[PDB]
Specification:
This is part of a larger assembly, with chains A (about 100 residues), B (about 900 residues), C (about 230 residues), D (about 400 residues) and E (about 375 residues). Chain A is mainly α and about 100 residues long. Chain A is about 40% helix and about 0% strand. In chain A, helix 4 crosses helix 5. The radius of gyration of chain A is 21 Å and the shape is elongated. Chain C has about 230 residues and is an alpha+beta fold. Chain C has one domain: Glutamine Phosphoribosylpyrophosphate, subunit 1, domain 1 (4-Layer Sandwich), CATH 3.60.20. Chain C is about 35% helix and about 20% strand. In chain C, helix 4 packs antiparallel against helix 5. Chain D is an alpha/beta fold. Chain D is about 45% helix and about 15% strand. Chain D has 15 helices and ten strands. The chains are: A mainly alpha (about 100), B mainly alpha (about 900), C alpha+beta (about 230), D alpha/beta (about 400), E alpha/beta (about 375). The interface between D and E is large, with 106 and 94 residues. Chain A: One of its GO terms (biological process) is positive regulation of inclusion body assembly.
């Protein structure tokens, strides 16, 4: 669906924009809400007028790229599943690792 | 909230004082009950006097405040204290003035709760106080009109103080006639017409009427308030029983006729059906009103306005009675007589013939059955009269060539076409008598009676010619003289008319179908008046039923005729009744229920109950089936109670036909035929949509006779744009053919649905109400409960006369023309206090006249507010006239 | 899509049919040729008193003895008038006497239709002008009134009206205005016809009149002169 | 108070007891009769029931064979997709049978008691159609020459066929309504159809085209056939702008579905059978889109442009609109007409509308000349930019 | 007042009275409805049996038949049988049929589809009229079309003009085209249908004009009704690349709107609210007058006015007056109503995060800061001049 995106700012954004509209006003359940509509995207290009402005969305989140801390914290919980040999620093493996993801 | 406060001098603390008795007052509750008895009178006066001033001020102040839900229970608890020993026990001079704000405590309760049970209760308690006050009440209403501190609530509420009078527990003439009813009527159209109807305070109103008219004119709309009182009286039939009720209808008719506004008076008179009432209407209006106005002219016009049945001026019991009333009334003998005389309404019809033309397609197609069918069609296209005069004048082509039953029938129908001629219809009749078989000659006699009616007031009448005819031996010639005599007069209480019927009507069964019609005709003579009776009809009816009832058409007419003859009051009837009673049959039993209604002089509460313990949907062969269908329809009932109540009644009547149909397999086919006649009589709310909807289904379904009845009423609007609807309906009529028998019913249906341009449809009510009553329509209805039609049967159907006179615009005061009038258009409806609804103009221009048609032109109104006048006669043109009432002897309205 | 340059099956161009409509949008101007002179009348139709009524012009001079009233888009006409001023004096340099109503009108009309929306020079029109001009003056030949159209059809008239009332007014002129009606009567005829398209009654701040009469040059009528014709309409 | 309280509780209570009667008598499940027209309708259906019509399963005749059993034999295929070899009944008369048309067969013994009515294959098209309603000429704007021209084409031959035959000229079939919107192309089409008093079929261009390719061929084919069989049909093909477009293919879906309806209408019209008893009226805002086949005569005999009116015509739209209104006649109809020239029919009705908006705010029941003047100067300046006409008139 | 009350009591009585009188008395009578009528109903139950095959009535034909497609995946030609009325039934209803011989016994079923449920989204606004700051008049012109014929139709009919339907809400967006649509709906208290325009363009081909027809049907019955079509502009500009409908599908759907509005078939008292950011990208006929009567431009709310709306906002997200109310307002130069919400909504989030229930000055400054990344404040308008 990369073709939907460059075509006119997403067919997938179309679904998000409508759900966001429905959720903005609906029945007597405008007052209380426990159903959110969440978007994952990685571009700012796709963003139509309702998405772009704040006080229409509760938050726009910017993610911090994977750092040296993040590799450790993820590595540590992972390493438990297998057998390990004593005297291996979890700190050492993460720090060398340049990653690109978890 | 603050406790007490009518014990504190400032006008502001009065407003919490009203709420305060919910908790209780500090001094004010004890002052009135306990202290008044306990402590001496002289000492009390100090306490009371300071309290009186506040209590009075407070009354205008309470009205000024807007609560009715916080206001209402709080002042009501306080009311008990005053009643105990402040009513008239305190002293002699002080209570009378103290009762004046007391009245106020009760009024809010009277008003808020607008039911009839609260009205009653509220009245019993209020009337005793009134008598104690001895005229403090009239002054109280006066202050209210001014408004010291009031500004809203007092407009509904003050009317209620008047409402209190009705009970008359102790009130003789201490306020029952005039206590400012006239301001109270003028502002509030609602509550006063009810109070007015019951009290017969309405009598005083006649005296007032000149003064009241001034308010009526264009300052306020009083015209609406008068129109309202009639609505309540007709509805009051169901509320309170008919014997209690008859005196009430009679009382309102005297006041309505005297007061200038005639349309309300005619509705009540029509319901009563008596001899006395009709003469009076002319003379009363003249003497009370010193100025000529509309008032003199009304006596004539009311006759014209009234739509019962058949020939022009309608009932014509009134027209025969008018010949010396006309003389008393005097706005010019010569003029008044010429206009009143049917020559003037006939004359306008003639002028109309040229523009009108003929819009269907004629046929006088020589020889065969085709000839006989064709003769029928001629009358049918108009459904009355139009420019058929040219076709009919040639005798030779249609009439002479017709064979058998066809000659009688064609000849019979010929008078109904030629009605609305004074002479030149007559010449044609005289010729046909001379020529050919006995049949043309016999149908011609009936025809003479109708034509001659175009001039009367002892100006060449119907009676003179018909009397000689009555002797004739043949059963067909006899029928023609007697049927023509009931058709023409349509009400008579002249000696000569009654005596001629007396030794004839010796028939009780005959081969000829049309001979049964003689009974209807004798009953027809009775209508519109009290009893002298004619013995022969009464005797023959019971005898006929036992003897034959196999011919359904024949059978229907004889019991109906019996009830109609009885109608009215008198002791002449008492003598023949003894003779009738000695014989008792199961057969007589149904006829008797109709008589109860008749006897009383119009009923509607007695009628109502009887229609529940009904003869409806009942037979043993066709023994009880004689009156059963006629009863079920309850058309007479629907129209009788208000135009407003009619809407509902109509839906129920339809529902009722459906009910008779489920019950009997046979009744289903009849129930379909019954709908066209029902609709036609009734003047329904469901007017356009319904007959057409049925009509289409009936093409597809067998029985062509269904289309033929349905078509009488379905023709509806006459072409302005209605041509598209008529032509489409007509197309369906034409297309169908499969036999001659089949073809004859369709052929008639096609030509009836069509109408010549700017003629009119059917009407049986007066055109400012849905109340009416015909006897003319019972005849086609009876002969069209059969399967198919015959040449014989066809002749009765051809008549649908009770149609309009061609004036529906400016009856005027020195006009009486066909020529149009200024009208304005409003889509508006805001009223519910008018005789059939009429809106207020904004004075914006549209094409001349209200529609000459029997429907439409109802929200299209008169402009008489650049004339600065008020209409008596409400604008409609269903049958209505646009005339207005001024102090002036003539309306100075503009023409266009 | 289809172009606008194309001929329709009716047998006319689209751009031009629109331009006639543009003439219909504006204010009405009447130009009457009388043989006593040529009067041009135009409606000001002001809606505010803060305006200065002298500077609302819709009569502009082609020449010093030819006046012109213009109708439809006021702006679109102004360019044609700018080019006209240069030609009249130019005509004086070459001929050594002043330009005629006929000569000036045929030369502006050539420019009126030239339109080629794409692949046409920027020194030439992409679209025609929606203005109708009325050139009214008296010149060496005598009083002449020539009418020019946005379709570039020029014709000689004696009474012509253009603007919103153009068809209505033109019919109505043919009736009252003839050559058995004098110049002052032409001014009265124009004033009556003017009122339906106007939002208000006729006034001396709601008309502008100028007459060019024989032996005289172009005169713009002063407040007194406007007021004398207002008195009797 | 008491009397009314009592009557409310009582009446309601009576409906509960009555409940057995409510269902039989009024309807709303379990007998929906009043037994004046149903006594007849039921009666006729019963004889059918008893032998072999009901349950009548809809099927259609695929082919007429004479193989297996009797000489009359037909292969019908039911709408469950199984074929059956069936007989033919004289038990009740077959009346509408044609090869390929729907026919009815029984589930107990599969034989044709009665064929289904002519070409009811789309039930979908038939339901939406109005049949000749009455539209007054107090809302069909103007007097105008523009109105009159269409009528000669549409109304006169249907109203009277008499004339055309006598001379020996062929009668009108075709008219093209073309011009920008808001000129009441729809508005007039309706009015004259009732005036003529012939059957009115309006159909939307969008409804002809539906999901699958060749589904669009089924609805159009069967609509034209249905039209021909009935007595006098006018099919008013409503508003085809891109739902009528010229044949092309993009290889993703293409113009295929759109052209499908278009082409179907061409195949039955010209065909090897000509147009039957079918008159055609086209509404297009774009003739620029249409196929060369449609634009030539034999369904488009005369082209008439109903477009933006003339200067005199705009005054006539004011006069017709005023009749509907209950506003002053002291308001000059003409003044409004000059103040807004180059205005379509829709725009002149918005002026009246606007005039009313100013009027309600002020709290008047009647519109004024003041409100009116204001309404036209706002229309000439503002409304022009939005208006449909510059782009649609270029295509026209 | 008194005459009205008695009339109503009578009307109610007459339906009841008549129906009842004929029945019970005919049970006493020896020939009319009596036994038969009670039996007829019993007889429908026994004839139908169990089970009953369900159908949907597409149309009734006047020939003693109807087209009801049975739930078995084949079509049936039903006859008026088992005591039923042909004309009584209105199209589109689900009906019960006797399986044993095809007859419509009666009508009661609808068997509810999810498509109507999606359409009907009732109102309950965030903010609404009379809690919105400045430009009071701008709302009142809108009311002319939407609100005012619902509140009083009387004024319009009496005047005699075409009842105003259709409005275009245009201008640069930040004024609350969405807010105004919600606000009018609460005030009028009429049914609120909300369908977003993007939803018309579907992944299915040719469903779009069908979905319009249904929208308007659902509105007519509901009516007086308001329909808010949020953002009509979205379908024309965009090609989602979820369909092969193309430019053609948009064009057919836009057209179907016109037909349903006035057309050959009108839909009674359905007003349309079109929010749009632009008027030049829209289809020509859709924005032509006489499908709208009122055209209004929203310019952005004034810098003074931003202050009067803010007090209200701060109070809603707990009142503090320790805030620099003026600074937050100032930096942002004449732009969206949306930014005022963002600054309060965020600040309150931050306060909670800090672990308190009171929003303070520091929280207001912080939220503001986060909002400048997310939007661009009002720095665009500043750069130009």
């Amino acid at each position: 669906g990369s073709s939907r995106l460059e075509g006119g700012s997403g067919g997938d954004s179309e679904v998000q924009r409508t759900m966001l509209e429905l959720l903005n006003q609906l029945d007597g359940f405008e007052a209380t809400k426990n159903i959110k509509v969440i978007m994952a995207t990685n571009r700012i290009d796709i963003l139509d007028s309702a998405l772009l402005r704040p006080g229409r969305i509760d938050r726009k989140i910017e993610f911090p790229p994977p750092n040296e801390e993040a590799r450790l914290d993820i590595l540590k919980i992972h390493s438990r599943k297998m057998n390990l040999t004593r005297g291996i620093n979890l700190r050492k493996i993460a720090e060398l690792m340049p990653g690109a993801s978890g | 909230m603050e406790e007490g406060g009518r014990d504190k001098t400032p006008v502001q603390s009065q407003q919490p004082s009203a709420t305060a008795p919910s908790g209780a007052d500090e001094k004010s509750s004890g002052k009135e009950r306990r202290d008044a008895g306990e402590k001496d009178k002289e000492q009390e006066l100090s306490e009371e006097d300071k309290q009186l001033q506040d209590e009075l001020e407070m009354l205008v102040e309470r009205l000024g405040e807007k609560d009715t839900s916080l206001y209402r229970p709080a002042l009501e608890e306080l009311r008990r204290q005053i009643r105990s020993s402040t009513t008239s026990m305190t002293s002699v001079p002080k209570p009378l003035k103290f009762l004046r704000p007391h009245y106020g405590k009760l009024k809010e309760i009277y008003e808020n709760m607008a039911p009839g049970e609260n009205k009653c209760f509220a009245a019993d308690i209020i009337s005793v106080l009134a008598m104690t006050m001895s005229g403090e009440r009239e002054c109280l209403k006066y202050r209210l009109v001014g408004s010291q501190e009031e500004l809203a609530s007092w407009g509904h509420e003050y009317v209620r103080h008047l409402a209190g009078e009705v009970a008359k527990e102790w009130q003789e003439l201490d306020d029952a006639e005039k206590a400012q009813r006239e301001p109270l009527l003028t502002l509030v159209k609602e509550i006063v017409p009810y109070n007015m109807a019951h009290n017969a305070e309405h009598e005083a109103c006649d005296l007032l009427m000149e003064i009241e008219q001034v308010d009526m004119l264009e300052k306020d709309i009083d015209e609406n308030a008068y129109s309202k009182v009639c609505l309540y009286l007709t509805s009051c039939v169901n509320y309170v029983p008919e014997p209690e009720n008859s005196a009430l209808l009679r009382c309102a008719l005297g006041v309505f006729r005297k007061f200038s506004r005639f349309p309300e008076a005619l509705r009540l008179a029509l319901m009563l059906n008596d001899m006395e009432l009709v003469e009076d209407i002319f003379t009363s209006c003249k003497d009370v009103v010193v100025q000529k106005q509309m008032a003199f002219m009304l006596g004539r016009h009311g006759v014209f306005l009234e739509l019962s049945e058949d020939v022009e001026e309608y009932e014509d019991l009134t027209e025969i009675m008018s010949n010396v009333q006309l003389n008393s009334n005097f706005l010019a003998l010569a003029r008044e007589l010429d206009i009143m005389e049917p020559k003037v309404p006939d004359d306008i019809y003639k002028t109309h013939l040229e523009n009108n033309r003929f819009g269907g397609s004629g046929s006088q197609v020589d020889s065969a059955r085709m000839n006989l069918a064709s003769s029928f069609v001629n009358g049918f296209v108009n459904a009355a009269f139009g420019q058929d005069k040219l076709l009919t004048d040639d005798g030779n082509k249609w009439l002479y060539k017709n064979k058998d039953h066809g000659m009688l029938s064609a000849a019979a129908s010929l008078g109904m076409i030629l009605l609305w001629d004074v002479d030149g219809g007559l010449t044609q009749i005289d010729k046909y008598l001379y020529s050919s078989e006995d049949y043309i000659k016999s149908g011609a006699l009936l025809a003479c009676g109708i034509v001659n009616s175009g001039v009367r007031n002892e100006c060449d009448p119907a009676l003179a010619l018909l009397s000689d005819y009555v002797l004739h031996n043949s059963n067909t010639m006899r029928l023609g003289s007697i049927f023509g005599l009931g058709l023409a007069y349509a009400g008579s209480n002249r000696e000569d008319v009654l005596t001629l019927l007396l030794p004839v009507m010796g028939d009780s069964k005959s081969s000829m179908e049309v001979a049964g019609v003689t009974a209807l005709a004798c009953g027809m003579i009775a209508v519109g008046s009290c009893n002298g009776d004619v013995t022969s009809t009464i005797l023959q009816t019971i005898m006929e039923k036992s003897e034959t009832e196999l011919k359904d058409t024949y059978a229907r007419w004889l019991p109906l005729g019996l009830g109609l003859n009885h109608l009215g009051k008198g002791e002449a009837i008492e003598a023949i009744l003894a003779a009738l009673e000695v014989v008792s049959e199961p057969f007589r039993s149904f006829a008797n229920t109709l008589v109860d209604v008749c006897a009383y002089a119009g009923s509607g509460n007695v009628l109502k109950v009887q229609q529940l313990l009904h003869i409806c949907s009942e037979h043993f062969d066709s023994k009880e089936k004689e009156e059963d269908k006629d009863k079920k329809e309850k058309k007479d009932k629907d129209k009788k109670e208000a135009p407003a109540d009619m809407g509902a009644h109509q839906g129920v009547a339809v529902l009722g036909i459906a009910l008779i149909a489920m019950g009997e397999e046979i009744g289903a086919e009849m129930a379909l035929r019954t709908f066209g006649h029902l609709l036609r009589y009734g003047e329904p709310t469901l007017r356009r949509a319904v007959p057409l909807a049925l009509a289409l289904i009936s093409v597809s379904n067998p029985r062509l006779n269904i289309l033929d009845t349905l078509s009488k009423f379905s023709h509806d609007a006459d072409p302005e744009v209605s041509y598209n609807s008529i032509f489409a309906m007509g197309m369906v009529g034409s297309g169908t053919n499969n036999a001659r028998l089949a073809a004859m019913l369709r052929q008639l249906a096609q030509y009836h649905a069509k109408d010549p341009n700017n003629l009119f449809m059917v009407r049986l009510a007066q055109g400012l109400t849905h109340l009416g009553k015909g006897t003319l329509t019972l005849c086609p209805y009876h002969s069209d409960r059969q399967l198919m039609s015959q040449v014989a049967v066809a002749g009765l159907l051809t008549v649908l006369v009770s149609f309009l006179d061609v004036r529906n615009i400016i009856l005027g005061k020195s006009h009486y023309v066909l020529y149009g009038l200024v009208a304005a258009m409003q889509p508006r409806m805001l009223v519910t206090f008018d005789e059939e609804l009429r809106p207020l103009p904004v004075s914006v221009r549209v094409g001349q006249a209200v529609d000459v048609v029997g429907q439409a032109g109802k929200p299209k109104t008169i402009t008489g507010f650049q004339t600065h006048t008020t209409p008596v006669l409400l604008a409609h043109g269903e049958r209505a006239e646009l005339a207005t009432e001024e102090f002036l002897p003539v309306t100075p309205i503009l023409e266009g | 899509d289809r172009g606008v340059n194309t001929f329709s099956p009716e047998g006319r161009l689209f751009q031009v049919e629109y331009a006639i409509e543009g003439h219909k949008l504006g204010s009405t101007a009447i130009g009457i040729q009388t043989s006593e002179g040529v009067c041009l009348a135009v409606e000001k139709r002001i809606t505010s008193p803060l305006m200065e009524p002298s500077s609302i012009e819709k009569i502009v001079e082609i020449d010093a003895h030819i006046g012109c009233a213009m109708s439809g888009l006021i702006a679109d006409a102004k360019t044609l008038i700018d080019k006209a001023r240069v030609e009249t004096q130019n005509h004086w340099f070459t001929y050594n006497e002043t330009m005629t109503v006929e000569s000036v009108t045929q030369a502006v009309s050539n420019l009126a239709l030239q339109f080629g929306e794409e692949d046409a020079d920027p020194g030439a029109m992409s679209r025609p002008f929606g203005v109708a001009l009325l050139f009214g003056g008296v010149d060496e030949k005598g009083p002449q009134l020539f009418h020019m159209d946005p379709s570039g059809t020029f014709v000689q008239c004696d009474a012509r009206a253009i603007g919103s009332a153009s068809e209505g007014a033109q019919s109505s002129l043919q009736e009252v205005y003839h050559k058995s009606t004098t110049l002052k009567e032409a001014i009265k005829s124009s004033l009556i016809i003017l009122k339906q398209v106007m939002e208000e009654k006729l006034n001396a701040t709601n008309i502008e009149l100028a007459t060019v009469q024989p032996g005289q040059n172009f005169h713009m009528f002063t407040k007194e002169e406007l007021e004398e014709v207002i008195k009797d309409i | 108070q008491s009397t009314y309280s009592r009557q409310i509780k009582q009446v309601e209570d009576d409906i509960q007891q009555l409940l057995k009667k409510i269902n039989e008598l009024t309807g709303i499940k379990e007998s929906d009769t009043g037994l004046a027209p149903p006594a007849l309708w039921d009666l006729a259906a019963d004889k059918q029931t008893l032998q072999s019509e009901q349950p009548l399963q809809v099927a259609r005749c695929t082919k007429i064979i004479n193989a297996d059993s009797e000489d009359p034999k037909y292969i019908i295929n039911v709408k469950q997709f199984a074929k059956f070899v069936v007989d033919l009944s004289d038990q009740v008369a077959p009346t509408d049978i044609e090869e390929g048309m729907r026919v009815g067969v029984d589930r107990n013994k599969y034989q044709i008691h009665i064929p289904l009515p002519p070409k009811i294959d789309p039930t979908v098209t038939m339901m939406q159609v109005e049949e000749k309603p009455d539209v007054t000429y107090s809302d069909v704007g103007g007097c105008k020459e523009q109105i009159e021209k269409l009528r000669e084409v549409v109304e006169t031959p249907l109203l009277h066929p008499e004339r055309f035959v006598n001379l020996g000229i062929e009668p009108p079939k075709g008219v093209l309504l073309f011009g920008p919107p808001g000129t009441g192309k729809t508005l007039c089409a309706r009015a004259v159809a009732n005036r003529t008093d012939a059957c009115f079929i309006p159909v939307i261009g969008s409804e002809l085209v539906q999901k699958y390719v060749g589904e669009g061929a089924r609805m159009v084919r069967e609509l034209f056939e249905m039209a021909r069989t009935k007595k006098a049909c006018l099919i008013f093909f409503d508003e085809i702008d891109a739902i009528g477009g010229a044949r092309f293919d993009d290889g993703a879906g293409g113009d295929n579905e759109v052209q499908r309806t278009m082409l179907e209408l061409i195949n039955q019209l010209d065909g090897f059978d000509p147009r039957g008893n079918i008159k055609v009226l086209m509404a297009t805002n774009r003739p620029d889109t249409l196929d060369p086949a449609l634009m030539r005569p034999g369904r488009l005999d005369r082209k008439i442009e109903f477009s933006l009116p003339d200067l005199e015509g705009r005054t006539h739209i004011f006069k017709i609109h005023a009749r509907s209104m209950s506003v002053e006649r002291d308001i000059r109809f003409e003044l409004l007409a000059r103040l807004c020239p180059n205005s379509t029919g829709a725009e002149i009705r918005s002026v009246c509308t606007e005039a009313g908006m100013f009027a309600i705010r002020a709290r008047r029941k009647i519109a004024t000349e003041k409100d009116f003047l204001e309404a036209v100067n706002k229309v000439i300046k503002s409304y022009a930019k939005f208006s449909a006409t510059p782009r649609y008139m270029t295509y026209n | 007042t008194q005459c009205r009350l008695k009339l109503l009591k009578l009307e109610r009585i007459k339906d009841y009275l008549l129906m009842e009188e004929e029945f019970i008395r005919n049970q006493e009578q020896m020939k009319p409805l009596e036994e038969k009528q009670e039996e007829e109903r019993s007889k429908v139950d026994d004839l139908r049996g169990t089970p009953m095959s369900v159908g949907t009535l597409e149309e009734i034909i006047d020939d003693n038949h109807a087209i009801v497609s049975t739930s078995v995946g084949s079509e049936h030609y039903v006859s008026i049988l088992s005591f039923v009325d042909k004309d009584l039934l209105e199209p589109g209803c689900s009906v019960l049929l006797n399986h044993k011989v095809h007859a419509v016994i009666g009508v009661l079923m609808d068997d509810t589809d999810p498509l109507v449920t999606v359409m009907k989204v009732e109102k309950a606004p965030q903010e609404t009229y009379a809690d919105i700051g400045g430009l009071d008049n701008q709302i009142q012109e809108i009311k002319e079309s939407v609100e005012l014929p619902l509140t009083h139709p009387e004024y319009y009919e009496e005047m005699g003009i075409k009842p105003p339907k259709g409005v275009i809400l245009y201008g640069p967006p930040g004024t609350g085209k969405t807010l105004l649509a919600k606000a009018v709906a609460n005030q009028t208290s009429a049914t609120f249908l909300r369908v977003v325009g993007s939803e018309l363009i579907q992944k299915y081909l040719g469903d779009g004009p069908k979905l319009v027809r249904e929208l308007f049907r659902v509105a007519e019955e509901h009516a007086p009704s308001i329909v808010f079509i949020d953002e009509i502009d979205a379908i024309g500009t965009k090609r989602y690349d979820s369909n092969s409908g193309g430019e053609r599908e948009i064009q057919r759907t836009m057209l179907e709107l016109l037909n349903q509005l006035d057309g050959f078939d009108s839909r009674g008292d359905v007003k349309v609210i079109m929010a749009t950011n632009r008027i030049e990208t829209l289809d020509p006929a859709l924005i032509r007058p006489g499908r709208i009567d009122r055209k209004i431009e929203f310019p952005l709310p004034d810098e003074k006015t931003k202050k009067r709306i803010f007090q209200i906002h701060t109070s809603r997200m707990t009142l503090a007056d320790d805030v620099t109310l003026d600074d937050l307002i100032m930096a942002k130069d004449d732009l969206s109503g949306a930014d005022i919400k963002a600054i309060c909504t965020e600040a309150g989030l931050m306060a909670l995060r800090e672990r308190r229930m009171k929003v303070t000055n520091e929280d207001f400054k912080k939220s503001k800061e986060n909002v400048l990344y997310k939007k661009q404040e009002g720095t665009p308008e500043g750069l130009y001049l």
